[PDB]
Design a protein around this nucleic acid. Sequence first.
DNA 1: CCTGCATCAGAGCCCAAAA
DNA 2: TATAATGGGAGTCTGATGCAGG
RNA 3: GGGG
Lengths: 346, 49, 49, 192, 96, 48, 193
Amino acid sequence: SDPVRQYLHEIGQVPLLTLEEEVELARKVEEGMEAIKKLSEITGLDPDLIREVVRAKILGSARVRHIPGLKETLDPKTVEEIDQKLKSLPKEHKRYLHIAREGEAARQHLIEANLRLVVSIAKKYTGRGLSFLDLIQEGNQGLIRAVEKFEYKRRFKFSTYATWWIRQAINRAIADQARTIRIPVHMVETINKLSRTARQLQQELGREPTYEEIAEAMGPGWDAKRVEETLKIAQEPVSLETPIGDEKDSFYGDFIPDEHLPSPVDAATQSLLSEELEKALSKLSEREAMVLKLRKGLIDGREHTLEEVGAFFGVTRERIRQIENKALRKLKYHESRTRKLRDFLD
Amino acid sequence: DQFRVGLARLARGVRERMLMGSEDSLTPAKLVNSRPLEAAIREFFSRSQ
Amino acid sequence: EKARDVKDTSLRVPPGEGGIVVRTVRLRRGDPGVELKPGVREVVRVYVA
Amino acid sequence: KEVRKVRIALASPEKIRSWSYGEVEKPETINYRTLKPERDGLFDERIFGPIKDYECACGKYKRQRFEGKVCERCGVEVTKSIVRRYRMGHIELATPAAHIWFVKDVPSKIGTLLDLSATELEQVLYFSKYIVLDPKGAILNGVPVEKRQLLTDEEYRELRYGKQETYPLPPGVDALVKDGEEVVKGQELAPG
Amino acid sequence: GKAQFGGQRFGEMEVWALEAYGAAHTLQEMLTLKSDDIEGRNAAYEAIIKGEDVPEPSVPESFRVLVKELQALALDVQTLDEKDNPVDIFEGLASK
Amino acid sequence: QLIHKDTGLIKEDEVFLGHIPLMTEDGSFIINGADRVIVSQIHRSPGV
Amino acid sequence: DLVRNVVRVVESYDIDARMGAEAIQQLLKELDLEALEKELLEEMKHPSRARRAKARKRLEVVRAFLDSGNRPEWMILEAVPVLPPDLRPMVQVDGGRFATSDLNDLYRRLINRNNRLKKLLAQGAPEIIIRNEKRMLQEAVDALLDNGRRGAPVTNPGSDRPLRSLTDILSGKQGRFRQNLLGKRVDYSGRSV
DNA sequence: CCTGCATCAGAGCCCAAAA
DNA sequence: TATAATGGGAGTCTGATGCAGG
RNA sequence: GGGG
Ligand SMILES: Nc1nc2c(ncn2[C@@H]2O[C@H](COP(=O)(O)OP(=O)(O)OP(=O)(O)O)[C@@H](O)[C@H]2O)c(=O)[nH]1
Ligand SMILES: [Zn+2]
């Protein structure tokens, strides 16, 4: 009924590995990877395709899907076709198939037996914007990376190598997913640096530092202006549903106007402006209105400058610039009488 | 009461820092992050009912 | 008349309010003693009685 | 035509897709520097419509002479920006998920149809117990497993992976049995 | 609120008042042209400044929000005519 | 004062914890420029 | 066994047993509603009063789906709809600050877990890990549709405020119906002493 | 068969609402 | 990318209805 | 917390 408690119970069902057991599983995974490489040469296939086919039979029919990068939809037909070419190999070649299968099996057990390690690292990273289980799942992702890269020959215990990859995965998770406005991982690193720096500066000075005091402490390249711009970028958004007051009946979003949609006054104004504009180009001449109207466009916006204007106005090409002026000129005289258009300048 | 909460939160930071990064080269000034305490007091005065 | 680069955002007077301007405080960035919240160049306060 | 009636009904996953203008592939919202929407994210204009009236994202086609065109470069339709209130997106789940209204609103609608109690439906949905589609002749604790039976994890592992146990031998003590040997329950393997 | 230049809240009990009087066109104005019916309120203002009478109202925008919110809950809300055929209250904008 | 339970090492320093708001003479506070009051709270006394 | 030169067969079955909404979607698909009506009608002819009572409640749901034309497996989601953006806005307020709707954080949680699930599947993670990921996905869908309904309410970090889900928006005094639908703020109005 | 017993969904309106 | 590190921290009162239990 |  408690999702953390349930998961803790499930990990506790896989016993921890002995030094021997740890080395045994690790050994089988490495040999299996080498087996798949060799199986590629012999067969003329793809090492990844073989690996997904080998892996499919260990986990069972439960998981069958297209894998991003694989050339074949990885449906029961293709895994049977390809598995039958692998089981049709001679005894000395076919020994490598058995190796790959057992490699994958040991990998599963190795991962499962180390899940408690991830919990003990993730619990220390709580409170940074990802839920505990989100931290465990990202931590588990690194553990998978660690199992694939582990070299057992170095005689190191597994826990030593895994921890680097698990710590790496959680920290990348926090940097990627914690913000409504996503920030590049490197930029998040810089922001955190300013925080630590200012926090030191406040501890020696007994008061808040200025932008200038932080810019000095950050070294060359930093002025006060850049510290401020960085802080502006680091601002997290706030919920529209944030309550205002002790009565539970007021939201912040309710105090925010909608600036996009035209207001009744403005919508009214736009209709009235189009109506006076066309009822104005026709009171000189429609044709000198037709030449001018094409040079801007009512609902289109057809302003180039000199080329395009070569085609259909009705004249050749320099002339349209001139009738643009007499249209604009007669409009200008005609405007002083019907000075109703002055007020639309706001 | 709000002060006591803020002090206990700062202690979480102390115990967690007494595990990571070298069990020796730490003074009290580097071990303490005052952010939890400042927020609790600022939280009480600016937003308590 | 070229369409101007800037628009008129001036602070005005709400419906039904108003009086005599008795004081003004102007606070910029880069004046002694004042730093505003990030991004804010200057703050002006007008007290009307 | 005039509205005389309002019907409300369930939506198939096909129909949910019949509404959708695109899949939201990323938790990203808007770009931190440009403040414009992130491509394929929750505000993407390629899915839900243009931010500005009759104007595409990159600005190749900027006015209403084109309505219905989809810009080749940036992918945004030229229409009224009002459509960002109307057009739906969708998320394609990897594994199906139950709609909580039809589970937790009592008596459960799913539960009544399948003759599953409140406790049972919780346990299957929240991954506490297995429910059997095809026993394939399995039998557990002497009785055959029948379809729609609930199994715990331990019960499932015994059925699915077999039963086994490992016994530690005190260091240096040699075993009283040989590798490969069939063994009865209670037989002595080592001094302890 | 006064500081936002707000409108007065005409609430559930106020609608009942208009209903008991049977003033349907007054009530409909409160529910459409004087609030969230966008096509109607823009059109109504234009009519008063031109001396024309205000137009018959259209679909209120907060109902369209309600429809889309039920779709986000995976419920199909369909407006129908007398012949049981679907009626499109989005005027083609949300369909491919 | 830092004490190492393992070693014996002692490093002592005075660390800055931030600011605490002060009450004025008439019993009020100044929080972000605005004068404020803290209202007393009645409740059930601890005990048995 | 390539060392011991033996093929072991460990006693165990090809049994099909599943967890979660995926299992349920199948059982709901494997319902012939016509038959279950027939069965429940035959059971409706029976004493002890309780037998007839339960067959009725069941028969009402069966008949509901039958008349309507709805398939029971639709109560399970494959594609989850996404509400249009202007209804969950991200807007720049006066100060140049951004203010955003709670639905965006609920969707982000969902999208991350879905993406992580796609990745864990392609990389062939163990069943324990895929199981954890799948149940977290249910909880993320559960918070999106009705938050707080089952389990701990999802909150923004460092706040006790439950995030406002689709169900909270529709229902209650502050809900869509009783706030913006049966009553509204209006133009051409004023107030005084 | 009947009764304890829990889990859930209810708890007035409008205005300032000083964030 | 390599000493080893392997199971978490935390908060009233009403009436109606569908449920395991003498 | 304050107005009817
Ligand atoms: N519903 C409601 N009404 C309120 C509230 N506060 C004030 N009122 C109004 O306050 C009024 C009280 O009026 P009274 O002056 O006590 O009326 P009365 O019966 O003549 O009493 P006297 O004037 O002393 O004779 C009622 O009419 C209410 O409508 C409130 O919070 N809720
Ligand atoms: Zn474009």
